[PDB]
Amino acid sequence: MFMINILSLIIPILLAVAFLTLVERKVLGYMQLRKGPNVVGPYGLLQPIADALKLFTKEPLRPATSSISMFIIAPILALSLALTMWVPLPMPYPLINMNLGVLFMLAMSSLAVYSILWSGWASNSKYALIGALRAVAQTISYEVTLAIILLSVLLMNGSYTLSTLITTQEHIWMIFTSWPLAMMWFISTLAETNRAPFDLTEGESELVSGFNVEYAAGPFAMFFMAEYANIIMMNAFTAILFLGASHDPHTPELYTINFVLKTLALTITFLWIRASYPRFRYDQLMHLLWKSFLPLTLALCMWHISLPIMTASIPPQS
Amino acid sequence: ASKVKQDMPPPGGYGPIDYKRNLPRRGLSGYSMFAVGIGTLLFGYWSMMKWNRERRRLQIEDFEARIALMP
Numbered sequence A: 001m002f003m004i005n006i007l008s009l010i011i012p013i014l015l016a017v018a019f020l021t022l023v024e025r026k027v028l029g030y031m032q033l034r035k036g037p038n039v040v041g042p043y044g045l046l047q048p049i050a051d052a053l054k055l056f057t058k059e060p061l062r063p064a065t066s067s068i069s070m071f072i073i074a075p076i077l078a079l080s081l082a083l084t085m086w087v088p089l090p091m092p093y094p095l096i097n098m099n100l101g102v103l104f105m106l107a108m109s110s111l112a113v114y115s116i117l118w119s120g121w122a123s124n125s126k127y128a129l130i131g132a133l134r135a136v137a138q139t140i141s142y143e144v145t146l147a148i149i150l151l152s153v154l155l156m157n158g159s160y161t162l163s164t165l166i167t168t169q170e171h172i173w174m175i176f177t178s179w180p181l182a183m184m185w186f187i188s189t190l191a192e193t194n195r196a197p198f199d200l201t202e203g204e205s206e207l208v209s210g211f212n213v214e215y216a217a218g219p220f221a222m223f224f225m226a227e228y229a230n231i232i233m234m235n236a237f238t239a240i241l242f243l244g245a246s247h248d249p250h251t252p253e254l255y256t257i258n259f260v261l262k263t264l265a266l267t268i269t270f271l272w273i274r275a276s277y278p279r280f281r282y283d284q285l286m287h288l289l290w291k292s293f294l295p296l297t298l299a300l301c302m303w304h305i306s307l308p309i310m311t312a313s314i315p316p317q318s
Numbered sequence B: 001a002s003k004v005k006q007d008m009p010p011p012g013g014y015g016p017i018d019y020k021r022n023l024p025r026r027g028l029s030g031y032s033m034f035a036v037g038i039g040t041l042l043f044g045y046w047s048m049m050k051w052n053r054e055r056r057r058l059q060i061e062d063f064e065a066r067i068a069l070m071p
């Protein structure tokens, strides 16, 4: 019966990823004065299925100079971690209830960078190596700031339990208390998901395809699925963190609908951002994260430590 | 005896054609934006202060229930 819950979490996520791609293409098209997929199925609704079927019936290539074990392992790790990050999210009840769910997401997101690193290095090609090193630089840029932002926001929650965030935001959204932290968190989530304007690891215009340039067919499909699942997961995490839906214990699907709508809004905002800005330079991304975000984040961490004591507003939990 | 017919501009001329850059201001002042931001922050701080004090009281009540049940 827990296996059924696992499947009911895994299969819909993959379906949403598949259709996210269609949504992504259509939104970009209409923002570019065109239509996007509207032939393969009514309103392009069968286009993701055709893409999935085409990719998995195409020949997978194993490069001659590549390291076989890491080359095959990296996409498996990417997709498995992308699926695993969903289990502690309360919608409004988590599949897995952790005392420290936030730390769990932090650690697993930190371990998801190795799929790009091992993939790029094991491809044994120059563009893949450049993509992997760009991933190293990206993580060095965003990690500390993201962690300190998370700590500063959760100081008003009282714990690292994700469900408690629903109780914290029963009357007001946390974005009205920490909007300066919310903006930096949103930018850091763009940087963490390798999304425009921070898509340096792929860098199509600069690096052809980046870390996955040598991947074809099914493994490439899994890398794409992992990336889009990460998009949806991170936006759901942001919606839980800063826009708390009201929960009725006898009426939980109201919370589920509200949370899904907020997550879709944030994902559509991601797609909107991709269509509006030029790409950063990765040294410029590091300088942005270390010279602007880091000092403000440190100051706001001090402020959000002092404020609950200042006003006698410390949250309940130990 | 047909007269000459050729693609020509209309008598007089064509209407004027704009070419100068047109980028309006379309914004508020910095003071106003900062004021709205700080006002939102203060309202949020007040609401969370009340909610967290109530939460502390509720936790004390729960702990008292546990204490009464412990023996």
Ligand SMILES: CCCCCCCC/C=C\CCCCCCCC(=O)O[C@H](COC(=O)CCCCCCC/C=C/CCCCCCCC)COP(=O)(O)OCCN
Pocket (backbone or CB within 6 Å): A180, A182, A183, A184, A186, A187, A197, A238, A242, A273, A288, A292, A293, A296, A303, B038, B041
């Ligand atoms: C009573 C006291 C209480 C506490 C006081 C708090 C007051 C705070 C007042 C200031 C808060 C501002 C927070 C903003 C933090 C970063 C701003 C910043 O300065 O960064 C910019 C740059 O930041 C960016 O512009 C990022 C670019 C990437 C843009 C990507 C998309 C744009 C964002 C879309 C909307 C985001 C919506 C976020 C909320 C979503 C919901 C969570 C610096 O870059 P440069 O211009 O190059 O200057 C440095 C070199 N001279």
